[PDB]
Amino acid sequence: ELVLTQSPGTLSLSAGERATLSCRASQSVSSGSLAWYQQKPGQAPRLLIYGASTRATGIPDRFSGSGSGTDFTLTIGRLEPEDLAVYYCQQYGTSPYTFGQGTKLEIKRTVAAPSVFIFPPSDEQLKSGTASVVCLLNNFYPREAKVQWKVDNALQSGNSQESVTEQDSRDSTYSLGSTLTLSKADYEKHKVYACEVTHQGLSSPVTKSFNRGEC
């Protein structure tokens, strides 16, 4: 079975730069039967190139393929933020068809401070015995950010979970959602709920808070 090895594993470039993705085969690929696919966050793969160098219909002119034998390359001439994705090569010259392990393309951009919002738990959820307090950090760039929850000024640990989106296809920023989870009893025994955010785009950590019981 033909093994396809892609390089590099991850490519970090700013919009406007040129991306060069390599795909090397363990054995000669018959007739240049090599295809390249683009898979954007949360989407199915999309054919970019086939026959090693033929650009597929509907594909932008910034995408080009080259190579023969055991060495192939996908070039993205002038990166656009929408090119954020994982790229895969695939040979179909011999059965079984095989794919490379993929190259993740990340986009570097300028620093952007997050907008921070807080959401108290809904009464509906509380009714059932659980309170999820949500803190939203919207559209910031350096992925690195710190969220610290405080209840009545006491620092929380071990009772929150966060999730971060993949870079936005338009502005390359990230968003992060942190959820503090408490039992209805614990939630109702405290008053001030605060989310303190630390990020490179902020001169000082900003805090979003609310007092349970207030409108």
């Binding site: 054919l47 079984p96 993929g102 738990p121 939203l136 409108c215």
Partner: protein, 233 residues
């Protein structure tokens, strides 16, 4: 779009699953239909396929004795059955279409043939687990004075305690796409998933525009619409 697949579902270890693929053009023409799977967070692997017009089918040895490929002209639908499922068969199964312009035949010239896929279906996530499915509880992330910035307000839906993946979320049935951020799910200590979807909109629209998140959880055959509005004081 023109390649519709069956819905995501959880399957017990040892059972069999059938993933369907319908060509919305009402015909198979001379296209080949392949199945390529992807474990969440990982790569792609070809499983096999069938070219209806020629009645030709084959697959990867990795799946010998476990896969069957068929196609029904009547319904323009192709199927793949995978048996004796195990946890490592958990993956998004994609239907991928291939063609062969061989001067009026299956494959005989110009250079390379039908090995690439120019059209993919949205995928069918099959989770192999002994745990039963559980639909999500959807709670509002109501916009308030605590979720506003400038003339913008953030709001959303918290999709809690469901199993297994995936959950898809749209806003206003797809009429609202700008500003939407749907977070990847987190696996809680309870073994159940949780995610949230947020959107930022003009604060001035909160009293006139209805905002509803449409949460789809095919594994449990559940679809939940949740209207999200400013909370009353």
């Amino acid at each position: 779009q023109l390649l519709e697949q069956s819905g995501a579902e959880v399957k017990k270890p040892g059972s069999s699953v059938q993933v369907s693929c319908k060509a919305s053009g009402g015909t198979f023409s001379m296209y080949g239909f392949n199945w390529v799977r992807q474990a969440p967070g990982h790569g792609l692997e070809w499983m096999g396929g069938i070219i209806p017009i020629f009645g030709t089918s084959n697959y990867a040895q990795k799946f010998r004795g476990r896969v069957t490929f068929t196609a029904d002209q009547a319904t323009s639908t192709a199927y793949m059955e995978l048996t004796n499922l195990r946890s490592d068969d958990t993956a998004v199964y994609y239907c991928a279409r291939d063609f062969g312009p061989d001067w009026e035949d299956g494959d005989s010239y110009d250079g390379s043939g039908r090995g690439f896929f120019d059209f993919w279906g949205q995928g069918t996530l099959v989770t192999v687990s002994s745990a039963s499915t559980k639909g999500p509880s959807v709670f509002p992330l109501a916009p308030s004075s605590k979720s506003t910035s400038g003339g913008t307000a953030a709001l959303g839906c918290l999709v809690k305690d469901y199993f297994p993946e995936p959950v898809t979320v749209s806003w206003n049935s797809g009429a609202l796409t700008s500003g939407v951020h749907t977070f990847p799910a987190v696996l809680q200590s309870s073994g159940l998933y949780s995610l949230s979807s947020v959107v930022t909109v003009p604060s001035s629209s909160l009293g006139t525009q209805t905002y509803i998140c449409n949460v789809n959880h095919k594994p449990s055959n559940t679809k939940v619409d949740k209207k999200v509005e400013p909370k009353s004081c």
